[PDB]
Amino acid sequence: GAMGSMERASLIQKAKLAEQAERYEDMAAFMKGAVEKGEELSCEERNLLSVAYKNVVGGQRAAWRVLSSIEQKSNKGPEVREYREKVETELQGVCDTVLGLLDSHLIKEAGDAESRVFYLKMKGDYYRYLAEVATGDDKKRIIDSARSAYQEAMDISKKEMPPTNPIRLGLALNFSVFHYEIANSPEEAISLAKTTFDEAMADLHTLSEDSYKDSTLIMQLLRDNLTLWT
């Protein structure tokens, strides 16, 4: 709504300025405005959208975990629960906003593997964040929504992208985290990380120096998780 009067190019320009200023709420609002212009996003623009919202929700999640820990230790008056609930509702609202952008209409217009995988990974991630705070009748459905998004992304990535593609790698990293932290499936998490790492290692020989650097950065995160989990 509020960004409706600003040029798409100006919104993208201001998102980049907001990133430099570490103003991630502004960054996200600018990128939401850009998405709502109705055009497909380029690779760079997709990454600006992702950075903005991941920083916003990352702060919310960190706050939620602090407050949830205090609340758990408490089990005084209603204030800890109320404030945890306030942060939770704000986080849920941001996740619903991102999911709404993906559904209206980024995913449906995304035909190339790179864009479709990127958006489905995001869909998995934001349902995952919803799952982290879920306790009601729809919690299993939230978890399944994350799983379904990640699984569609995985199926396309395996068919259409090399094993070293950074999006394919990051998707596998995050789906492995889903398995370990949300689905109570540590063995699946470990298997996925290990297979991803090994298949990427075997394809590094095909890469330029710059691509190598990108792929190996994410492989190291896989390895770091495998080290933590084993």
């Binding site: 990352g58 991630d125 990293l173 995050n174 985290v177 994410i218 995160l221 770091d224 998780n225 989990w229």
Partner: peptide
């Protein structure tokens, strides 16, 4: 556990 970081 760590997921993919932001830059």
């Amino acid at each position: 556990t760590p997921s993919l970081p932001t830059p």
